[PDB]
Amino acid sequence: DKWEMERTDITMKHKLEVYEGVWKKYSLTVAVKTLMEVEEFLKEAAVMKEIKHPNLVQLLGVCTREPPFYIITEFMTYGNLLDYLRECNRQEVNAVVLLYMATQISSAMEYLEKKNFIHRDLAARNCLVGENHLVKVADFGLSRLMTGDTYTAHAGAKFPIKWTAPESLAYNKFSIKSDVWAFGVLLWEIATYGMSPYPGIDLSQVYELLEKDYRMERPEGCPEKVYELMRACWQWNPSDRPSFAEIHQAFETMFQESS
């Protein structure tokens, strides 16, 4: 395999099983993860070989000959978007930046939508931040749509409820429209600067509240056009949610208008 590489070619710098390392022959700073369900992680890593986008965490190499196994990706200097938003200078990370980050995420998601991929865990915590408000979506659990629009997770799989769409909670069914729902919650996260969704709401009551058309309030300072998009993402019927092509077009327009 072109992706297979020499384990001695990576030097470990700092623990962040996931380390900050150096691809010595390229003098490049990388992120290396060291590996029962180990073979599942390598299958998930094999998916990453097929995708290439400026807003998706780049797979660079893999070590699958001897234990422990290495998975090598590009290194994202500022960590995850959740911790970033909470710890930032909001005077620097303003409305325009909030708009730029959503354009970057919807761009990544329009690509996956077109290439028939499913994310299944879209949250600010699974978005990585580079320098100058660069956002790349974490792509370490993608499911390819082999047949049909809908993926069915195995019975008895637990999900992050506050981000999971109603049909996914009720029937374990996942689609790009279920990623459109999770994207809406991520917009709320960006708009609130990493605040927890459905604040104070008992997890075991979220599904029944969504059934009766309960939706999160519009954050303070959140543009009406962006809340409308959040609300359009949270339609009960997956068919009624916009495409990621529709979402990215609206955000690219709003970020261009903002300039």
- The gap between the terminal CA atoms of the chain, to the nearest Å, is 45
Q: Annotated binding residue at 225?
A: no
Q: Is 141 annotated as a binding residue?
A: no
Is 224 annotated as belonging to a binding site? no
Cβ-contact 12, 23 below 8 angstroms: no
Contact (CB, 8 A) for 70 and 7? yes
Tokens of 208: 């029944």
Would you say 214 is a known binding-site residue? no
Rounded CA-CA distance 17/41 in Å is: 13
CA pair distance 74, 56, nearest whole angstrom: 10
62 is in an annotated binding site: no
| Full set of structural domains in the chain with CATH | 1-75 (3.30.200.20), 76-257 (1.10.510.10)
Q: What φ, ψ does residue 182 adopt, rounded to 5°? A: -65, -30
Counting every residue written for the chain, the total comes to 259
Structure determined via:
X-ray
> Cβ-count burial of 178 within 10 angstroms (0-12 exposed, 13-18 middle, 19+ buried)?
buried
Q: Are 161 and 203 in contact (CB under 8 A)?
A: yes
Q: Report, as residue numbers or ranges, the catalytic residues.
A: 121
Candidates 155, 134, 152, 133; CA nearest to 143 is: 152
